[PDB]
Design an enzyme around this catalytic site. Structure first.
Site, mmCIF file in Angstrom:
data_model
loop_
_atom_site.group_PDB
_atom_site.id
_atom_site.type_symbol
_atom_site.label_atom_id
_atom_site.label_comp_id
_atom_site.label_asym_id
_atom_site.label_seq_id
_atom_site.Cartn_x
_atom_site.Cartn_y
_atom_site.Cartn_z
ATOM 1 N N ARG A 1 -37.244 32.327 118.769
ATOM 2 C CA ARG A 1 -37.143 31.282 119.686
ATOM 3 C C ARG A 1 -36.447 31.609 120.902
ATOM 4 O O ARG A 1 -35.333 31.514 121.189
ATOM 5 C CB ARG A 1 -36.233 30.295 118.890
ATOM 6 C CG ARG A 1 -36.826 29.486 117.706
ATOM 7 C CD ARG A 1 -35.737 28.472 116.968
ATOM 8 N NE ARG A 1 -34.413 29.242 116.666
ATOM 9 C CZ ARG A 1 -34.337 30.019 115.819
ATOM 10 N NH1 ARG A 1 -35.112 30.305 114.794
ATOM 11 N NH2 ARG A 1 -32.911 30.713 115.436
ATOM 12 N N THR B 1 -33.687 32.772 108.574
ATOM 13 C CA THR B 1 -34.678 31.827 107.516
ATOM 14 C C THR B 1 -33.871 30.761 106.984
ATOM 15 O O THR B 1 -33.912 29.757 107.435
ATOM 16 C CB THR B 1 -35.316 32.779 106.652
ATOM 17 O OG1 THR B 1 -34.338 33.552 105.856
ATOM 18 C CG2 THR B 1 -36.255 33.864 107.185
ATOM 19 N N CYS C 1 -43.445 35.569 100.275
ATOM 20 C CA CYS C 1 -41.938 36.089 100.497
ATOM 21 C C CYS C 1 -41.429 36.733 99.256
ATOM 22 O O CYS C 1 -41.150 36.079 98.152
ATOM 23 C CB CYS C 1 -41.207 34.776 100.935
ATOM 24 S SG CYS C 1 -39.499 34.917 101.325
HETATM 25 C C1 7HE Z 1 -33.883 39.157 103.512
HETATM 26 C C2 7HE Z 1 -34.870 38.803 102.735
HETATM 27 C C3 7HE Z 1 -35.545 37.515 102.840
HETATM 28 C C4 7HE Z 1 -35.077 36.150 102.967
HETATM 29 C C5 7HE Z 1 -33.632 35.833 102.634
HETATM 30 C C6 7HE Z 1 -36.220 35.663 103.094
HETATM 31 N N1 7HE Z 1 -37.471 36.430 103.290
HETATM 32 FE FE1 7HE Z 1 -39.312 35.746 103.263
HETATM 33 N N2 7HE Z 1 -41.366 35.045 104.064
HETATM 34 C C7 7HE Z 1 -41.753 33.729 104.533
HETATM 35 C C8 7HE Z 1 -43.042 33.706 104.702
HETATM 36 C C9 7HE Z 1 -43.864 32.556 105.259
HETATM 37 C C10 7HE Z 1 -43.593 35.398 104.790
HETATM 38 C C11 7HE Z 1 -44.788 35.614 104.784
HETATM 39 C C12 7HE Z 1 -42.451 35.790 104.148
HETATM 40 C C13 7HE Z 1 -42.467 37.096 103.723
HETATM 41 C C14 7HE Z 1 -41.229 38.273 103.516
HETATM 42 C C15 7HE Z 1 -41.368 39.422 103.449
HETATM 43 C C16 7HE Z 1 -42.585 40.216 103.519
HETATM 44 C C17 7HE Z 1 -43.625 39.992 102.585
HETATM 45 C C18 7HE Z 1 -44.902 41.038 102.566
HETATM 46 O O1 7HE Z 1 -45.315 40.530 103.714
HETATM 47 O O2 7HE Z 1 -45.607 41.361 101.966
HETATM 48 C C19 7HE Z 1 -40.054 39.947 103.206
HETATM 49 C C20 7HE Z 1 -39.521 41.463 102.942
HETATM 50 C C21 7HE Z 1 -39.207 38.690 103.127
HETATM 51 N N3 7HE Z 1 -39.976 37.640 103.527
HETATM 52 C C22 7HE Z 1 -37.884 38.834 103.053
HETATM 53 C C23 7HE Z 1 -37.001 37.573 103.025
HETATM 54 C C24 7HE Z 1 -40.854 32.676 104.805
HETATM 55 C C25 7HE Z 1 -39.546 32.606 104.192
HETATM 56 C C26 7HE Z 1 -38.771 31.528 104.115
HETATM 57 C C27 7HE Z 1 -39.123 30.016 104.393
HETATM 58 C C28 7HE Z 1 -37.442 32.017 103.704
HETATM 59 C C29 7HE Z 1 -36.025 30.658 103.336
HETATM 60 C C30 7HE Z 1 -36.076 29.525 103.507
HETATM 61 C C31 7HE Z 1 -37.341 33.268 103.639
HETATM 62 N N4 7HE Z 1 -38.747 33.654 104.033
HETATM 63 C C32 7HE Z 1 -36.326 33.959 103.335
HETATM 64 C C1 LIG Z 2 -42.303 35.464 109.009
HETATM 65 C C2 LIG Z 2 -41.001 35.839 108.617
HETATM 66 C C3 LIG Z 2 -40.092 34.514 107.925
HETATM 67 C C4 LIG Z 2 -40.694 36.920 107.471
HETATM 68 C C5 LIG Z 2 -39.326 37.249 107.406
HETATM 69 C C6 LIG Z 2 -38.874 36.813 108.651
HETATM 70 C C7 LIG Z 2 -40.128 36.440 109.567
HETATM 71 C C8 LIG Z 2 -39.963 35.673 110.806
HETATM 72 C C9 LIG Z 2 -40.793 37.657 109.581
HETATM 73 O O1 LIG Z 2 -40.890 38.597 110.778
HETATM 74 C C10 LIG Z 2 -41.254 38.140 108.323
#
Ligand code: 7HE
Ligand SMILES: CC1(C)[C@@H]2CC[C@@]1(C)C(=O)C2
Ligand SMILES: [K+]
Length: 405
Positions: free
Chosen positions: A177, A243, A348
């Site tokens: 943002r 997130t 995710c």
């Molecule tokens: C600190 C770790 C962490 C946390 C707390 C989140 N994520 Fe996640 N995330 C999300 C989307 C749409 C995608 C492609 C990823 C992919 C990811 C990927 C990559 C997966 C991939 O591209 O293979 C990682 C490592 C990831 N997310 C670590 C991550 C959405 C979320 C949402 C909605 C939340 C919480 C409400 C979230 N992430 C918390």
């Molecule tokens: C798309 C995401 C929610 C996922 C974790 C943080 C984010 C903005 C990324 O750059 C990958």
């Protein structure tokens, strides 16, 4: 302004929606995006905002695009184009087959086994923060809980000092943002500037923290490079800092506004996990995208090689074709359809950590502060971008209705 309409895009598909400042934002950010699902709107539209790009507006197309990584590539996933081009996080900026080998390593640092390691401390920090607020009868939820709870869990997991939060939080928010002071590339390079020495230090002297584990990790049996480790750690920082931080505020704003929904969870707290899923559907917040790898006709629309397409998760979860009365929050919703944690090969990896933080927050908050409201006269402002959020959330309650555990 509006970028000139490319010759291959027909006029009837043009809907000039601005993902960074949607016109109808004052109604709520999810509501603002849902303007794209009004009666006169095709499944796939072109906006001339933010350099010009497609937006898929229904769950069916969104899921299909996510599944088809041959036509729809993660190599340039963010709008505007300069941001997508700069974006090189791992595994998010990669397509299968190369993407997959990096998931196992990220799973080692944020997956279920780690959530188990952190279980008690997550629980402890939620309770301590909420108990400190409880007697006050008021808080600024974004700064008093939404930020410190998930961020301090993340800094702990990553072994980073809490005094670094303001700087890192600022930079992360410039990627999602932007205030205009930094380009996406500048903000990302600043995050890299932070990580580079820490990664080198922890490759020399490994600890047990997430950065050490990634930096010393193996990828399908070969050592990770310093560059690959940096690109993975950048993603982890954004996950940890921008997130759940935003999602908690959307959820708590809703609960503050709905005594009936609070009561449901007060009376039947075992419904909190189902409530979490329904809130994840209704208050989804990520606007992910892809780049076309060739000219391709998709749902009767001619897409051109290099065109970007936004696949906003709000639109899958709020799609009335998939979820009846989609703006209504129904904790007893039978088949909760959403792509809030993504879809296809990029699901995710932080989702287990995210759900634990959400569920613990709802349980521990409603236990102590069952009855709360938006401060009188306050008007809650949302902000839109790659990840949407809540600018401020002043809450009030009568301390006599609270319970110290
Ligand atoms: C600190 C770790 C962490 C946390 C707390 C989140 N994520 Fe996640 N995330 C999300 C989307 C749409 C995608 C492609 C990823 C992919 C990811 C990927 C990559 C997966 C991939 O591209 O293979 C990682 C490592 C990831 N997310 C670590 C991550 C959405 C979320 C949402 C909605 C939340 C919480 C409400 C979230 N992430 C918390
Ligand atoms: C798309 C995401 C929610 C996922 C974790 C943080 C984010 C903005 C990324 O750059 C990958
Ligand atoms: K890129």
């Amino acid at each position: 302004n509006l970028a000139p309409l490319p010759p291959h895009v027909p006029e009837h598909l043009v809907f000039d929606f601005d993902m960074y400042n949607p016109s109808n934002l004052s109604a709520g950010v999810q509501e603002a995006w849902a303007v794209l699902q009004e009666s006169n709107v095709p499944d796939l539209v072109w906006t001339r905002c933010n350099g010009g790009h497609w937006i898929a507006t229904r769950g069916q197309l969104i899921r299909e695009a996510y599944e088809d990584y041959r036509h729809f590539s993660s190599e340039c996933p963010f709008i505007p184009r300069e941001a997508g081009e700069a974006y090189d996080f791992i595994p998010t900026s990669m397509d299968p087959p190369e993407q997959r080998q990096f998931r196992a390593l990220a799973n080692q640092v944020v997956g279920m086994p780690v959530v188990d390691k952190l279980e008690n401390r997550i629980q402890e920090l939620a309770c301590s923060l909420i108990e400190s607020l409880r007697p006050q009868g008021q808080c600024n939820f974004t700064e008093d809980y939404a930020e410190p709870f998930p961020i301090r869990i993340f800094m702990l997991l990553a072994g980073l000092p809490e005094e670094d939060i303001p700087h890192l939080k600022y930079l992360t928010d410039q990627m999602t943002r932007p205030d205009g002071s930094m380009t996406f590339a500048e903000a990302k390079e600043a995050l890299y500037d932070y990580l580079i020495p820490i990664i080198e230090q922890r490759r020399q002297k490994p600890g047990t923290d997430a950065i050490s584990i990634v930096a010393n990790g193996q990828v399908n049996g070969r050592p990770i490079t310093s560059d690959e480790a940096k690109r993975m750690c950048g993603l982890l920082l954004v996950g940890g800092l921008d997130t759940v931080v935003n999602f908690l505020s959307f959820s708590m704003e809703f609960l503050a506004k709905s005594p009936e929904h609070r009561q449901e969870l007060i009376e039947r707290p075992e419904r909190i996990p189902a409530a979490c899923e329904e809130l994840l559907r209704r208050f989804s917040l990520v606007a992910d995208g892809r780049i076309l790898t060739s000219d391709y006709e998709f749902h009767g629309v001619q897409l051109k090689k290099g065109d970007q397409i936004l696949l906003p998760q709000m639109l899958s979860g709020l799609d009335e074709r998939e979820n009846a009365c989609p703006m209504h929050v129904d904790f007893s919703r039978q088949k909760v359809s959403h792509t809030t944690f993504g879809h296809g090969s990029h699901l995710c990896l932080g989702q287990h950590l995210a759900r634990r933080e959400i569920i613990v927050t709802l349980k521990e908050w409603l236990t102590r502060i069952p009855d709360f409201s938006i401060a009188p006269g306050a008007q809650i402002q949302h902000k839109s971008g790659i990840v949407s959020g809540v600018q401020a959330l002043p809450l009030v309650w009568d301390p006599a209705t609270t319970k110290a555990v």
